[PDB]
Amino acid sequence: DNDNSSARLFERSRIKALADEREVVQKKTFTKWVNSHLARVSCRITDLYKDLRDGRMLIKLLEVLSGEMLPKPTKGKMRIHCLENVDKALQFLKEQRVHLENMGSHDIVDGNHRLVLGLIWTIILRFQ
């Protein structure tokens, strides 16, 4: 088990760190990029994972970037209404030839870090 212990230590040290500084850098960079465009409608985000759960912030970001006007989000605070808002945002992204896989409403709502970061990166890279 000593060999397995050394291997497990390698897993929980090296790969953890080599990911972890990368997403904590990219989170700040993406937050700055989104907040710069979102200043025109006078809306700020202070944490990337919490603010994208409602789906209205992503709708406003696509509102600023796209140039035309998206459908209304549902005026409700339930989980299913958040799923509606995120699904509407993903539908609008799908209509503009943007390729997304392993992307769903429940993934954004539940707060998966790497999938939210991948969605933001795809919007940055392909839409602008």
Binding site: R14, A17, E21, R22, V25, T29, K32, W33, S36, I124
Partner: protein, 41 residues
């Protein structure tokens, strides 16, 4: 024909020693960033 004619195995050994030294030190360093994201900062 695959390997270049003039090369050093000691170069490969020194290179893997340089990588393993950084593994031992465990210095934190982020990955490369795109130039498009370099523009926004």
């Amino acid at each position: 024909q695959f390997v270049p004619l003039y090369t050093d195995p000691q170069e490969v050994l020194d290179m893997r020693n340089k990588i393993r030294e950084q593994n031992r030190q465990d210095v934190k360093s982020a990955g490369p960033q795109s130039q498009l994201l370099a523009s926004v900062i």
